[PDB]
Enzyme design. Structure first.
Site, short mmCIF file in Angstrom:
data_model
loop_
_atom_site.label_atom_id
_atom_site.label_comp_id
_atom_site.label_asym_id
_atom_site.label_seq_id
_atom_site.Cartn_x
_atom_site.Cartn_y
_atom_site.Cartn_z
N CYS A 1 0.84 -1.20 0.00
CA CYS A 1 0.00 0.00 0.00
C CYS A 1 0.87 1.24 0.00
CB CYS A 1 -0.99 -0.16 1.18
SG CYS A 1 -2.35 1.03 1.18
N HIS A 2 0.75 2.12 1.01
CA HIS A 2 1.58 3.34 1.07
C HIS A 2 2.96 3.08 1.68
CE1 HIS A 2 -2.17 5.58 0.31
NE2 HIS A 2 -1.34 6.49 -0.17
N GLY A 3 3.19 1.85 2.10
CA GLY A 3 4.47 1.48 2.72
C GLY A 3 5.71 1.90 1.97
N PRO A 4 5.69 1.82 0.63
CA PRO A 4 6.89 2.24 -0.09
C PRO A 4 7.25 3.70 0.00
CG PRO A 4 5.66 0.72 -1.42
CD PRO A 4 4.79 1.04 -0.24
N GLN A 5 6.39 4.56 0.54
CA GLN A 5 6.80 5.94 0.76
C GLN A 5 8.06 6.04 1.65
OE1 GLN A 5 2.97 7.51 2.12
NE2 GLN A 5 2.83 8.64 0.21
#
Lengths: 166, 166
Positions: free
Chosen positions: A100-104
């Site tokens: 999800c947004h984890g790669p930010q």
């Protein structure tokens, strides 16, 4: 193995809690780090105890890293120590799972050049600008980096990640 | 195997969703049945698609049964077809997993006399009155019936249950 999760308030509840249980089931030790000790609370209202503050974490201590999504990565990615932990574990070739947004957090760590993976499609362009190849698949395994998109992908995310754990 | 979940609106979100993904992970087919096709929504606001209405389900077509908790079991236990499905599967020795308020469905099926298991402590007296021996453990395995109490138990609940799907 000792498995580290980085997170904060506003995590996507399932993306943190279902893997926490899945990895315990295997008999690994799981730790949740965040800004301070205490508890943090997900988008949907579940709470989770925090074992460690970022500043207590030594990257050498842990064998694997899990980065859940939600709104938490947007504030975690600003913390210099969280970034460093992530950089050091990622570049040492330890299993790193993101959804999800984890790669930010990975973007801010500066480790994605030349890598391949996925995320929520709402940050695809940001992943690409960080130097990675983005693809729309339920799970992508790029060496030590296992990546998925959203809570519907959980089963595939964990299937491939658990293989890497020993 | 085909694994069947019985639920409705007001399910405890983790108790349905984390096992659904765990069991898909293994390569089993998972089906969610409720009063009608559509979507159901949990206590904490997650939604899940319903594959089958209770009336479509043939007991003999499924290999194992999961009964999550929350407030859903109080309404599911009133449905004659859900109770029939439960009774038949449970009496045939097929693996049945319950957690939290899940056993209210088992109570109403009339299958608990001389059995042994756990639940949320708030319905202990009802489980005992139904003829079962109640114990306070994270997971209890009584033949085909694997039971746990609450979301803190999930890792132990799934560990023992997935063993039975071998």
């Amino acid at each position: 193995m000792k498995v580290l999760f980085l997170s904060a308030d506003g995590f996507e509840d399932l993306e943190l809690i279902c893997p926490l249980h899945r990895i315990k089931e295997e008999g690994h030790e799981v730790y949740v780090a965040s800004f301070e000790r205490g508890k943090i609370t997900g988008k949907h209202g579940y709470s989770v105890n925090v074992d460690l503050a970022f500043e207590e974490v030594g990257p050498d201590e842990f064998d694997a890293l899990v980065l859940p999504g939600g709104r938490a990565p947007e504030i975690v990615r600003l913390n210099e120590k969280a970034i460093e932990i992530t950089r050091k574990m990622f570049e040492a070739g330890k299993p790193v799972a993101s959804i999800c947004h984890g790669p930010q957090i990975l973007i801010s760590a500066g480790v994605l050049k030349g890598r391949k993976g996925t995320s929520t499609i709402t940050i695809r362009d940001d992943v690409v600008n960080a130097g990675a190849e983005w693809v729309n698949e339920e799970v992508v395994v790029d060496g030590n980096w296992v990546s998925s998109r959203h809570p519907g992908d959980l089963y595939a995310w964990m299937r491939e990640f658990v293989k890497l754990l020993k």
